[PDB]
Write a protein that binds this ligand. Structure first.
Ligand SMILES: [Cl-]
Ligand SMILES: [Cl-]
Ligand SMILES: [Mg+2]
Ligand SMILES: [Mg+2]
Ligand SMILES: [Mg+2]
Lengths: 136, 136, 124, 124
C-alpha cells in the first residue's frame, strides 16, 4: 500500500514531463505531486518500516520541483539529500543537472554529467581474508 | 586555536598506534583522545564557524575507538559519519576496515579495500555549456 | 583459452577509444588516438565479420566504435553506425547512448538528442 | 606531436597490467595477460633505457611493472624491482605501494607489509 502511494507519486512526476502539456497543466500536475509528497513526508518521517518508499519519494521530489521551475529548491533538496548519505539514482542526477544549469551555474551541471559516465577498473590484489588480516 | 585543539586530538590518536607502547599505555592514550573528543563534540556541534575542525575530529575519532579495541563502535561511528554524507579520507577507511575484520566481518573489509584502489577514466563527450543546455 | 586473445584485442580497442576522450588533450592528439582505434577496428571488422566464436568480441567493438567516430568529430557517421547497430537489435549500453546523443546534437538535431536521453533514464 | 606514440604505448602497457587484476579470471588467463604486459615491458625497457625524450614514459612502465610481476605471482621480483626503483628516488604512487605490500606479505614477510601500509596513509 505504501508502495502504491509512492508509485502514484512517481507516476504524477512522470506525467509532469509531458511536452504535449502546456505550462498551466504542467504546473498543476507538479502541484498534485508536490502535495502528495508534503503529506507522505510527514506520514513517513519517523518510520523504519517505510524507510524504502520514503527514499523513493525523496528523489522523485527533485522531478516535481524541477517541473515547476523551482530550480534553487531542486538544488537545496539535492544538497539536503546529499547530507543524508542517500544514493541519488542517475535519473535523479539528470534532474539536478537541468536545475544547476537553469540557475546560471553550468560548471556544476558538467561535473554531474562527468561523474555519471566513467569507466572503473579495480587494482585489488586478490588477498585472502587471513592475508588482509595479517595487514592489521 | 580550534585548529591546534584538533591538531592535539590528532597527535594523541597517532601516539595511540605506537607498538613500542604496551596495552595499558595504548588504552590510556586512546582514553586521553576519546575524552578530548567528547568535550570538542559538545563545544562544536551547533557551530558553522568550526565546521572544518569538527569534521577532522569526527574521522580521527575512528582511530581512537579502534586503538581501544571498540570495533563495533568504530563501525557504528563510521555508519553515522556515512549518513552525514561526510567524505572519509583513505586513512579513515583503513581504520574502519581493520575494525570490520576484527568484528569477524571480513567481506566488508575487502569491499572497502577494493573501493580504495581503482582506476577511473571519464567518458565525458566534451560538451559546451550551451550544448549541455540544448540537452534540457 | 581461445576467447582470451580476441577478448584482449577488444579490450585494447576499448582502452584507445577511452584515451581519446581525455579532455587534457588537443584536437591533433585526440584525432591521432581516435585514428589508432578507428584502424584497430577496421582490421578486426574484417578479421571477425563471419565468425560465431568471436560474435561477443565483434559486438563490443561495434559499440566502442561509436566513441572513436564521435571523438574524431564524424557526427553523421556515429548516427548512421548507431542506426545500423539499432536494426541488429543489440543493446547500446547507456554510455553509448550518451555518445550518440552528443553526435545528434552536434549534427544540429537537438530534439532527437533529448529523445535519446529520455530512453537513457527510464526506470518504470 | 612526438611524446604521443610513446605515451599511448605506456598507456597500453598500463591497461594490460590492470586487465591482469580482474578477479573474474582464472590463474591460466591472469598469467597469460600478465605475460603480454611483462613482454610489452621487456621491449620498451630496451627501446627507451638511454633516452631523455622518453624518461617520463620509461618511469610509468617502471611502476606499472610492479603490477604485472605481482599478478604472475613473482613476489620476490616485485620486491627486488621495488627496492631498485626506491634507490632511483622516484615516487611509487599509492596503488604501487599497495601492490608491493601484497608481495611482501605473500613472501611470508608481514611486518614489512604493515610498514609499507603505514607510509601509504600518512597525512601529518
Ligand atoms: Cl565506420
Ligand atoms: Cl623484471
Ligand atoms: Mg581503464
Ligand atoms: Mg568503454
Ligand atoms: Mg594503473
Amino acid at each position: 500500500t505504501p508502495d502504491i502511494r509512492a508509485d502514484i507519486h512517481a507516476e504524477l512526476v512522470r506525467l509532469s514531463f509531458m511536452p504535449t502539456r502546456s505550462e498551466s497543466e504542467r504546473y498543476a500536475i507538479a502541484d498534485r505531486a508536490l502535495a502528495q509528497y508534503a503529506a507522505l513526508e510527514i506520514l513517513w518521517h519517523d518510520n523504519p518500516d517505510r524507510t524504502a518508499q520514503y527514499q523513493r519519494i525523496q528523489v522523485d521530489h527533485l522531478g516535481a520541483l524541477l517541473t515547476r521551475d523551482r530550480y534553487k529548491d531542486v538544488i537545496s533538496h539535492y544538497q539536503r539529500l546529499k547530507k543524508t548519505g542517500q544514493i541519488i539514482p542517475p535519473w535523479g542526477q539528470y534532474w539536478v543537472a537541468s536545475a544547476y544549469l537553469k540557475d546560471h551555474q553550468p560548471k556544476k551541471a558538467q561535473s554531474i554529467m562527468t561523474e555519471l559516465f566513467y569507466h572503473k577498473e579495480t587494482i585489488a590484489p586478490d588477498l585472502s581474508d587471513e592475508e588482509l588480516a595479517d595487514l592489521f
